[PDB]
Structures are given as C-alpha cells and as structure tokens.
Amino acid sequence: KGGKNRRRGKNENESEKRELVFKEDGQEYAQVIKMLGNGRLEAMCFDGVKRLCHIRGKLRKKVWINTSDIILVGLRDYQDNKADVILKYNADEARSLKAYGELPEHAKI
Amino acid sequence: KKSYTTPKKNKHKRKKVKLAVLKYYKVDENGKISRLRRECPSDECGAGVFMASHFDRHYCGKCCLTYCFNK
Amino acid sequence: VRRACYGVLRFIMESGAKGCEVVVSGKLRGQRAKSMKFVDGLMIHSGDPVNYYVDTAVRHVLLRQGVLGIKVKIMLPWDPSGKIGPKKPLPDHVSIVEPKDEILPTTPISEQK
RNA sequence: CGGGAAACCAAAGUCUUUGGGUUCCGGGGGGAGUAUGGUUGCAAAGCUGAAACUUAAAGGAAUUGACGGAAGGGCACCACCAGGAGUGGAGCCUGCGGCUUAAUUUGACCAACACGGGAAACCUCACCCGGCCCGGACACGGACAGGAUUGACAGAUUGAUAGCUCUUUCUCGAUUCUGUGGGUGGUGGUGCAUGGCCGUUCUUAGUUGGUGGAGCGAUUUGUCUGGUUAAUUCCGAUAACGAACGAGACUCUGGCAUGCUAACUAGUUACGCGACCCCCGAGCGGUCGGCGUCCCCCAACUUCUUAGAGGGACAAGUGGCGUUCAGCCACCCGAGAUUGAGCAAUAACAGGUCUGUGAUGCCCUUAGAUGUCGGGGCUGCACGCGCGCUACACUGACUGGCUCAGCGUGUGCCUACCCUACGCCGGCAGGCGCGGGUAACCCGUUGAACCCCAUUCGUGAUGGGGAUCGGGGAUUGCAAUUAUUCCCCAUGAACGAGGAAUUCCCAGUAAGUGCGGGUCAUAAGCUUGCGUUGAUUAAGUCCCUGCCCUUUGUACACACCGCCCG
RNA sequence: CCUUUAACGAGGAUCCAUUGGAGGGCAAGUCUGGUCGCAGCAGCCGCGGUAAUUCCAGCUCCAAUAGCGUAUAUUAAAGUU
Numbered sequence: 001k002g003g004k005n006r007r008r009g010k011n012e013n014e015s016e017k018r019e020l021v022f023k024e025d026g027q028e029y030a031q032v033i034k035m036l037g038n039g040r041l042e043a044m045c046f047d048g049v050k051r052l053c054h055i056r057g058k059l060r061k062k063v064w065i066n067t068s069d070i071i072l073v074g075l076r077d078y079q080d081n082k083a084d085v086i087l088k089y090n091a092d093e094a095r096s097l098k099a100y101g102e103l104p105e106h107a108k109i
Numbered sequence: 110k111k112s113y114t115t116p117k118k119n120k121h122k123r124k125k126v127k128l129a130v131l132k133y134y135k136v137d138e139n140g141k142i143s144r145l146r147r148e149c150p151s152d153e154c155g156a157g158v159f160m161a162s163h164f165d166r167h168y169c170g171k172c173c174l175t176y177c178f179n180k
Numbered sequence: 181v182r183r184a185c186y187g188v189l190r191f192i193m194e195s196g197a198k199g200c201e202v203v204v205s206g207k208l209r210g211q212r213a214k215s216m217k218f219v220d221g222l223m224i225h226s227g228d229p230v231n232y233y234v235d236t237a238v239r240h241v242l243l244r245q246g247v248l249g250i251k252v253k254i255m256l257p258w259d260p261s262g263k264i265g266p267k268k269p270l271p272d273h274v275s276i277v278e279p280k281d282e283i284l285p286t287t288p289i290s291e292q293k
Numbered sequence: 294c295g296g297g298a299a300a301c302c303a304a305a306g307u308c309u310u311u312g313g314g315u316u317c318c319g320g321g322g323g324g325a326g327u328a329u330g331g332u333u334g335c336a337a338a339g340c341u342g343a344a345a346c347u348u349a350a351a352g353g354a355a356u357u358g359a360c361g362g363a364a365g366g367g368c369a370c371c372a373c374c375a376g377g378a379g380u381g382g383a384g385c386c387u388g389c390g391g392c393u394u395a396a397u398u399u400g401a402c403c404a405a406c407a408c409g410g411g412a413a414a415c416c417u418c419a420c421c422c423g424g425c426c427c428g429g430a431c432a433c434g435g436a437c438a439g440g441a442u443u444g445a446c447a448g449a450u451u452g453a454u455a456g457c458u459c460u461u462u463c464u465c466g467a468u469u470c471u472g473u474g475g476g477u478g479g480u481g482g483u484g485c486a487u488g489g490c491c492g493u494u495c496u497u498a499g500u501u502g503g504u505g506g507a508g509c510g511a512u513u514u515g516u517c518u519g520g521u522u523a524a525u526u527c528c529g530a531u532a533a534c535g536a537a538c539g540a541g542a543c544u545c546u547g548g549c550a551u552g553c554u555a556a557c558u559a560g561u562u563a564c565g566c567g568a569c570c571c572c573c574g575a576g577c578g579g580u581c582g583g584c585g586u587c588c589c590c591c592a593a594c595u596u597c598u599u600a601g602a603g604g605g606a607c608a609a610g611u612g613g614c615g616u617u618c619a620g621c622c623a624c625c626c627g628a629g630a631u632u633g634a635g636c637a638a639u640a641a642c643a644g645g646u647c648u649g650u651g652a653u654g655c656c657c658u659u660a661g662a663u664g665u666c667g668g669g670g671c672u673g674c675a676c677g678c679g680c681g682c683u684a685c686a687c688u689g690a691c692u693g694g695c696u697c698a699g700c701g702u703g704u705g706c707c708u709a710c711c712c713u714a715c716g717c718c719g720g721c722a723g724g725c726g727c728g729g730g731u732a733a734c735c736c737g738u739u740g741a742a743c744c745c746c747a748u749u750c751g752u753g754a755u756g757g758g759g760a761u762c763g764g765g766g767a768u769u770g771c772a773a774u775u776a777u778u779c780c781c782c783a784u785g786a787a788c789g790a791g792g793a794a795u796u797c798c799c800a801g802u803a804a805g806u807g808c809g810g811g812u813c814a815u816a817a818g819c820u821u822g823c824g825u826u827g828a829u830u831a832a833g834u835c836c837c838u839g840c841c842c843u844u845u846g847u848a849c850a851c852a853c854c855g856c857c858c859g
Numbered sequence: 860c861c862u863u864u865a866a867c868g869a870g871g872a873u874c875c876a877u878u879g880g881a882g883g884g885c886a887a888g889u890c891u892g893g894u895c896g897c898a899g900c901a902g903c904c905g906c907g908g909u910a911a912u913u914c915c916a917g918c919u920c921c922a923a924u925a926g927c928g929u930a931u932a933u934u935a936a937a938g939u940u
Contacts, residue, residue, distance in 0.1 A: 008643085057897075119660095206488065213486085226539070228545090240488055245910085
C-alpha cells in the first residue's frame with residue numbers, strides 16, 4: 001500500500017529470513033498460470049500435470065501472490081483436479097532452488 | 110543468537126594419565142633409603158618433594174614459572 | 181480485587197482524608213489488560229498544592245500471569261492547625277477564612293475611671 | 294380524552310373488560326411481476342400469475358457518536374493575509390532507504406529520519422570469524438586415600454609466552470571429577486501476554502455523580518435563548534437544587550525601592566597618606582586640580598554588588614460605551630490591568646519502549662552455549678530523501694590599531710584523573726620549571742566576537758569560495774592503517790542567488806555574532822542554556838489548513854481511509 | 860413358560876449398566892496433555908491463526924436409565940391462518 005493507516009493494529013512483521021522445506025510427499029512446487037478472482041486461483045505443477053490451486057487460511061489477505069512465480073502446493077489426498085496451496089516462497093528463494101537443481105529448469109521469472 | 114553449527118574436532122580437558130603412584134623411593138636394604146634424583150632446592154619448596162627426572166630437562170613441578178635446569 | 185479495594189478505601193477515608201483513590205492496572209478475567217478505578221471524596225491534580233496535600237505510592241505485585249500495578253493516592257485533610265504538617269490554606273479553591281463579630285448598644289454617657 | 298413500538302392521531306379513540314353492518318387484501322428476505330397457458334390490443338403492452346433453487350437476515354421508529362464539496366456562531370503565525378529570514382539549487386557533515394558484503398547488528402516510518410544522550414579505533418557490541426574458560430547451585434548414585442583430583446617448564450603446535458592439544462614427568466590432595474535428577478545465565482523471541490514511564494488525540498475548554506423532574510427504554514434535564522470573557526469566565530434566564538475535577542487560584546522568573554536588615558570570601562567614599570608620574574592647568578617643580586597603583590585604618594557608609602524580611606498594581610482614578618448589569622475602549626499616575634516558564638481533567642490509542650530496570654508472564658537456548666580473549670564490521674557505493682553547516686563578495690575580504698559582557702565550570706571524583714596564572718624554550722602545534730584553587734577567596738577586575746578606526750585589493754570565478762589532494766611536524770592511547778585530533782607549506786573544484794514546492798516567526802522578538810554546560814583518555818558542523826548588536830511588518834480575518842459550540846441530514850458505528858451498483 | 864418345591868448358588872478384584880453431555884440457549888470444568896484457522900466441532904449463536912472452559916485424549920462432574928441417541932412424517936408451542 002501507499003502508507004495510509006489502520007495498518008498497524010496487527011503484527012508488523014516481516015520475514016526475518018528463512019528457510020526452507022520442499023516438496024514433501026504430495027506437497028510440491030508449482031507455478032501460477034492465471035489469476036482468477038473471488039479467491040481461488042490457477043497454477044500448473046512443475047511435473048507436467050496441471051491442477052487448480054486453492055488458497056489457505058492466514059495467507060488469505062496476509063500475503064499477496066501476484067501472477068507468475070513459484071509456489072508450494074499440497075495435493076489433496078484423494079482429489080486430482082483441485083489442489084491446495086501452502087507456503088509460497090520468495091523469487092530469490094526460487095532462483096536459489098533452481099541453481100541448486102532440485103526443481104525442474106524450465107520456467108523463467 | 111541462533112544455534113551452534115557442527116564442529117569436527119572439539120575435545121575439552123585431558124584425562125591427566127592414570128599412572129602408578131609412589132615408586133620414587135627405592136628400598137634394597139633397611140634402614141637405608143635409596144633416593145634417586147635430587148629433592149627440590151628452593152626456600153619456598155619444602156625439599157620433601159622430588160624434582161623431575163626428565164633428562165634433557167630438569168624441572169620442579171611445585172614451581173610453575175621458575176627453576177628450570179636442562180642439563 | 182473489588183472487595184479488597186473497597187476495604188482499604190473506607191479505612192483511609194475513616195482515618196481522616198478529604199478523599200482518596202486506588203488504581204489497579206493489569207490483567208484479570210482473560211489475557212487483555214484493563215484498569216479499575218475506585219474513588220471517593222476530593223482530589224487535586226494541578227498546581228503547587230499537589231506537592232503538599234497529596235502523597236502517592238506505586239508498588240508492583242506479581243502473579244502467575246504477569247504483573248499487576250497498584251497505585252494509591254490519598255489527600256491530607258489538615259487546614260485548622262497542627263501538626264502543623266501541611267499548610268493551613270485550602271488547596272484547590274483557596275478559601276477566605278472569615279470570623280464574625282457585630283454588635284453595638286452605644287448611647288452617650290461619661291463613665292469615669 | 295384514549296390509543297400507539299414510536300413518530301404521531303378527537304381519530305389511527307371507545308380492543309385480552311376482545312363481537313354495529315360489509316367489501317377488498319397480507320404471511321421472513323430473494324428467485325419474479327420472471328416462467329407458462331389464457332385473454333385484450335394495429336403496434337407498444339395491459340390484466341391474470343408459479344416453481345426449482347438460495348439465504349439469517351431483510352425492514353420500521355427512535356437515541357447516542359462520527360462524517361457532510363449543510364446552516365449559524367467563535368478561535369490559532371504548528372492556518373492565512375501583511376511582511377521578515379530561509380529550505381528545495383551548489384560543496385561539505387550527519388541520519389534514513391536501496392545496493393553490495395563473510396558481517397556490513399538493531400529499533401523507529403503530523404505523532405520515524407543530528408531520534409534510541411547512538412559524535413562506534415579497542416572497550417562499547419547486540420553482528421561476523423577463530424581460540425579458551427565454567428562462574429552447571431543443590432540432591433541422589435558412582436569413583437575414592439598406591440587416592441577422587443590441581444597446576445606447569447621445555448619441545449612440537451598455535452595470532453598467541455591458551456598445559457588448548459600432543460610429546461615429556463613432576464606437582465596439587467576430597468575443594469573435585471563422572472552419571473542421573475535439578476538449577477543458572479542470555480542486548481534470545483514475543484510492547485498484539487504485561488508493569489512502569491513517555492508520546493498523542495488536545496492547548497483546546499472540556500468532564501461527572503447525588504436527589505428531584507421528563508421518557509416503555511437506550512437516554513435526557515442540570516451542562517442554557519441572550520449579553521460577556523483568554524477560559525463551562527461571569528451576568529442573567531430557569532424543572533431543577535446543591536456540589537466536584539480541569540480553567541483560574543498556586544509555584545518559579547523578570548520588571549519598581551537612595552525604605553528596612555548587614556557584610557576585609559563584596560564595594561564605595563573619605564581622608565591619613567607617604568611613594569610614582571607629567572606641568573598637563575592657576576602657580577614654580579611645592580600646594581590646589583587631574584591620572585591609576587601600592588598604603589590603607591582602631592575611619593565613615595551600604596548608593597553600586599550580594600540575599601533576606603517587607604511594601605507596590607487593584608480595572609484603582611477620570612472620560613466614553615454597555616441592560617448601565619457582567620464588562621469593553623481611551624487617558625492621568627506609572628512598572629498598566631498579557632514578561633516568560635513550571636504544574637494540568639474525563640476517556641482513549643492494539644502509538645513507542647522486553648536493547649533502562651536483580652520490573653515481569655510464556656516460549657526458546659544452556660557445555661560443540663545466545664554466558665569470555667584476539668581480529669574484522671556498524672564508515673563498505675551507478676542511486677533516492679531528511680536535519681544542518683559553509684558560500685557565492687565592495688553593506689566585502691585582507692593586514693594592523695582601539696574597545697565592551699554574561700549563564701557556568703574546575704584536581705582531593707571511578708579506580709587515576711582538573712582548571713590554569715607566572716618563568717624559560719620553539720614559526721606553530723607543543724615542551725619544560727614553579728605556584729594557587731574544596732572555590733563572591735585561585736584561574737577571572739572572565740582584558741570574547743560581531744561592531745569601531747586606519748592601510749591594501751577593484752567588478753575580475755578576482756586576493757571572492759576552500760572542496761579535492763601531495764609532503765612534513767606535534768599531542769592522546771596498550772594500539773591511530775580505511776588518513777583519532779592538532780599544526781606548517783603546497784594543490785585551488787563546484788558555486789556568480791537558485792524550478793515545482795515548502796518551513797518558522799509579533800518585542801530586547803526575528804536575524805547577525807561569540808561563549809559555557811552535556812558526551813569526552815583524544816574530538817562538535819549536534820543538542821541545551823547564556824550574553825552582545827538589534828530591524829521591516831500586523832493590531833486583522835475564516836480564504837486555505839485545522840480546532841471548539843449549536844442546528845440539520847445519513848443506507849455510516851472497523852465510524853467517509855465509511856458504505857455500496859452494473 | 861409361569862407359580863410350587865429338593866440340592867448347589869454373592870465378599871465386591873466379581874453373579875460387572877449403559878447412552879449422551881459439561882461456552883450460552885439448558886442441568887454440569889476460565890482442570891491436565893496434544894493440535895494451532897490445519898484436523899475437526901457447531902440444530903442455532905459460534906469455537907480453531909502456539910496460553911482452545913466448545914477440537915483430539917485423560918481425570919472429574921451432570922442428565923435419563925434397561926434404556927438412550929440419530930433421521931423423517933405429524934401435532935402442541937403458533938393469537939406466525
């Protein structure tokens with residue numbers, strides 16, 4: 001935002017930086033395809049399978065996930081088409097992961 | 110602030126080896142006491158303690174900064 | 181807290197005092213803080229009389245959940261005389277101490293002494 | 294009258310004490326006047342009229358707040374007008390962001406940003422990289438007097454002269470070590486768990502209960518139509534009456550004493566003077582007069598200086614004006630009813646502070662330690678912003694000469710340290726020898742700057758400006774490199790009055806100018822106080838920005854930085 | 860089968876009472892451990908974002924009781940036909 005107010009009643013902040021789970025079992029890296037409204041959003045997984053991603057509590061209006069960029073997504077235990085967002089990263093964090101050679105080397109930022 | 114990261118050495122205090130004790134006085138016949146190396150000559154030393162038989166080095170361990178003969 | 185604050189209050193009022201005040205700031209009935217004022221009588225807050233006619237104390241008291249602040253403020257009553265401790269004039273509105281006498285029965289006469 | 298949820302209504306009255314006659318019509322909010330079939334119409338459409346599915350609110354009246362590009366009053370140089378000086382432009386200092394880095398520690402975004410006393414060499418220090426130490430209480434068990442255990446030379450190793458480690462072999466003696474249980478430390482985290490403190494709303498005039506009155510109640514009256522004041526300040530009105538907090542009163546400071554009190558740790562005057570000095574003036578040089586110093590007292594005094602007790606100013610008097618009330622304006626006397634500060638209500642803020650606190654909850658960490666030594670960093674730059682400093686010359690610079698001040702402070706303290714006169718040496722920084730000061734006593738009759746008086750330069754990026762940069766000399770310290778500070782010579786940049794914007798100020802005030810204190814081993818371009826020189830402009834207003842009171846409107850109450858539509 | 864009668868047949872450890880609930884409506888925990896807007900609970904109002912009186916468990920307590928819970932039709936509550 002551009003300053004304003006009423007934005008201090010509540011817990012500043014910030015990311016004192018930090019670090020770094022993965023993947024886990026059904027809990028992996030994806031890239032934002034589109035940017036729907038209402039709340040949900042689209043995101044193609046890095047493996048090759050598409051899926052539709054869903055936001056998670058807290059991260060609601062506490063973290064904006066602009067279009068295009070890596071993001072951490074849990075897969076639903078039983079559901080294929082819909083999947084559940086976790087834990088986003090940083091663009092710097094995503095290029096460090098790419099340099100390490102753990103996610104596939106296909107997408108640009 | 111954050112937790113300690115792994116070393117690849119650390120060792121604290123040496124165990125100060127578990128030597129057999131008093132063989133410093135030698136008995137071959139009585140009442141004679143066969144002393145080996147000289148007992149320490151300082152005024153502040155009691156001269157009841159032995160000096161080290163440490164040849165090419167000759168040092169009172171009661172002293173801790175002084176009185177080191179070496180020949 | 182309430183019954184304790186009342187009990188101390190009436191004693192300091194009974195012993196003599198224009199008025200008196202108690203504050204308890206800190207937690208109770210949950211993990212957000214509040215404040216609890218218990219007040220009776222007169223009080224002053226401004227001017228130089230604050231140095232004479234009130235005394236004020238602060239004491240911290242612990243509990244298993246945080247700290248509670250006690251503060252007590254009490255107003256001294258003497259104005260007629262003695263010890264003399266605090267000065268005789270009234271503090272906030274400084275009163276005009278007014279004696280009265282008023283008689284005459286005079287008529288002319290000469291009275292020799 | 295009576296009714297009504299209230300607004301209101303002689304009807305919307307005569308209703309749980311329910312019934313005069315009769316017609317039409319309603320059943321949470323949407324879906325929807327849509328779908329569908331019927332009917333009427335030339336057309337446009339009218340009348341008649343569902344469900345599936347969805348949702349816990351939609352809606353009415355009234356009250357209290359907030360808000361209004363609503364209305365009426367009042368107020369502020371953090372608002373304006375009238376103006377003064379600047380900032381923004383240039384160079385430099387410093388704080389902040391971004392970037393870099395092994396680390397470039399961290400809080401804070403009108404009410405952060407020369408702020409955290411935060412001008413960091415080490416220390417500080419929270420950061421980064423190496424090394425060492427335990428200062429792990431206490432309990433229980435184990436070990437254990439040919440013994441638990443302690444320390445160390447040299448050599449090797451090491452930044453290291455850390456027995457840290459290893460080689461080597463003496464020394465210490467129940468203090469311990471080892472295991473388990475349990476503590477302890479932390480500038481570790483959480484100011485959205487808290488105490489305390491501070492800032493801000495808010496420098497305005499606001500605020501509350503009792504008893505009575507008015508309402509089903511939330512609430513309201515008291516706290517006001519009007520006049521008046523800087524002010525909820527008074528006068529007056531009056532279903533309210535009598536009170537409380539803030540305002541004021543109060544404290545400190547300035548301005549008025551030839552009145553009072555009393556002074557070799559304060560002065561003045563008077564001689565006594567004797568001494569020096571020049572006739573400089575009458576006279577002769579003496580004396581009389583003039584210049585300061587020594588001499589001064591058992592002299593006289595307290596005007597000056599010092600600090601105590603008191604007095605003085607009240608809208609007091611006069612003239613206007615006002616209800617003739619409360620007050621307001623002018624004038625005499627004179628110090629005019631305002632010299633400047635301190636103290637300051639109710640309620641609130643998810644404001645700041647866990648890095649002031651042996652204040653503190655909970656969580657974390659605790660021997661390979663977040664508790665100690667050595668080194669590095671907080672100063673690293675293609676950039677953005679803030680507070681300031683110095684400048685752009687002649688109302689000046691430069692070199693001589695003259696002449697005036699105040700608030701303070703000072704060794705005997707923290708652990709090693711003060712302020713300096715005088716003598717000597719050096720261009721200077723400085724060195725060295727002696728002496729005083731617990732301080733109205735010594736430094737210091739604080740012999741300061743701007744200013745004042747006389748030379749030189751001449752409209753020239755000049756001799757204005759002093760940035761950048763080379764070499765050399767001193768001082769502080771254990772250590773001065775990324776230059777601690779100071780001095781000498783040389784080098785000589787931007788800058789020739791500054792866009793869009795914007796800050797602050799009304800009388801010893803603005804501006805110019807120096808000094809003391811704070812931090813301090815060495816060192817203010819900062820902050821806090823003090824003197825000196827000393828204007829122009831206003832005596833107003835609600836235009837902008839904002840604030841107080843009333844009235845009004847509201848779909849707002851997370852309160853317009855609101856809510857809400859396709 | 861029932862009633863009637865021999866003989867065996869009770870020391871609480873077993874000759875074993877369960878079904879729901881404990882934030883409010885509504886009788887009963889601002890107890891302890893785990894989870895941390897996740898998993899779940901919740902007729903309704905609402906609980907969970909690391910200090911959960913509502914979740915998952917333990918202990919304790921409350922209601923009814925050889926019965927108690929849940930779904931659906933329907934009446935009373937409804938002067939909301």
